[PDB]
Amino acid sequence: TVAEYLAFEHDYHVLVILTDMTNYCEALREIGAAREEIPGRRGYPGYMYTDLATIYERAGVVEGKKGSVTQIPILSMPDDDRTHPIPDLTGYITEGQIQLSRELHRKGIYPPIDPLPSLS
């Protein structure tokens, strides 16, 4: 809301970097089980898709004004699989991805972005 305010009432260009979207989803599961509602798929709550798309799709340029919110969510994959529901639904809402690689890092390359699984 601070970024969307700045871009759509002072016409800035804003880059929003959201660190560790896995911790958000784990706290979301925690608050669901605190508020006594049933875990859906994989233990994550059933409403996770819309409650994650609400904080993804507040990006985007707007016709008729000059601001622009660009959004880089960064997420630790739990066990290096993109079949887990958190990177699955993130890659199922967002625009492509870039993927840090295990091999290039621990043989020594910085930043360790391989371009074979990445996509824009």
């Binding site: 784990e26 706290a27 599961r29 925690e30 608050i31 669901g32 089980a33 605190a34 875990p39 233990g43």
Partner: peptide, 11 residues
């Protein structure tokens, strides 16, 4: 409980 019977506040 949360996943596998643990309480939610465990984390």
């Amino acid at each position: 409980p949360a996943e596998e019977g643990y309480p939610p506040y465990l984390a």
